[PDB]
Amino acid sequence: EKKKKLILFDFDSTLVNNETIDEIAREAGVEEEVKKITKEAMEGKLNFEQSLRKRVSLLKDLPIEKVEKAIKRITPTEGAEETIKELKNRGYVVAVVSGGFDIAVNKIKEKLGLDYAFANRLIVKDGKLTGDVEGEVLKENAKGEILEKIAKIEGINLEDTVAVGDGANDISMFKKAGLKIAFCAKPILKEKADICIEKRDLREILKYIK
Numbered sequence: 001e002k003k004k005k006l007i008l009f010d011f012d013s014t015l016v017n018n019e020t021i022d023e024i025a026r027e028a029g030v031e032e033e034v035k036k037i038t039k040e041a042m043e044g045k046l047n048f049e050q051s052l053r054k055r056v057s058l059l060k061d062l063p064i065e066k067v068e069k070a071i072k073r074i075t076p077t078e079g080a081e082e083t084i085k086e087l088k089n090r091g092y093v094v095a096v097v098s099g100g101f102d103i104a105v106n107k108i109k110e111k112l113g114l115d116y117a118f119a120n121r122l123i124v125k126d127g128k129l130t131g132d133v134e135g136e137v138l139k140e141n142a143k144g145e146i147l148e149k150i151a152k153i154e155g156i157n158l159e160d161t162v163a164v165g166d167g168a169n170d171i172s173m174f175k176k177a178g179l180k181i182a183f184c185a186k187p188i189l190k191e192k193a194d195i196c197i198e199k200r201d202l203r204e205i206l207k208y209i210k
């Protein structure tokens with residue numbers, strides 16, 4: 001009869017080792033420029049949505065096959081599946097909320113056995129990226145809105161939620177969460193975290209969760 005907890009994870013650099021957008025940028029020949037903007041966005045120096053639309057536009061015309069080649073290089077962070085299975089083993093609900101893309105996130109949702117997955121989407125036409133991106137994980141308070149929505153669906157009080165993030169777009173998720181864990185995170189998020197983990201193994205979060 002114990003109560004369930006809801007645990008939300010950020011995708012890029014948290015559940016997986018890579019930054020999806022930077023990997024696709026490599027295939028489009030704009031890795032350096034995109035990497036730089038990604039770093040500023042995660043450090044909180046830029047509005048997230050404007051920074052993402054700017055990086056995605058540099059991907060215009062990339063064939064879908066090259067997008068997949070970049071996605072295939074994405075690997076799960078050390079300890080990811082074991083950690084998710086242990087949380088589910090306790091009866092907890094687990095979700096991934098990402099400013100990244102369904103094309104990468106959908107895969108990991110099934111691979112790791114997550115209950116919820118929210119991400120943006122790359123627009124495609126004639127088998128190539130158009131350079132646009134649309135979705136519900138763009139606005140500054142988007143992740144916090146999703147955390148509240150999932151918690152309501154599950155009947156779980158916000159005090160019983162845990163957010164694990166690593167970038168500035170995880171700040172709104174931290175505002176609503178009962179426990180805030182910064183996983184090998186940028187300074188702007190570490191300032192706001194309850195706990196900061198710097199060892200790159202997702203199982204390290206289990207020590208802090210009953």
Ligand SMILES: [Mg+2]
Pocket residue numbers: 010011012013014165166167
């Ligand atoms: Mg991240």
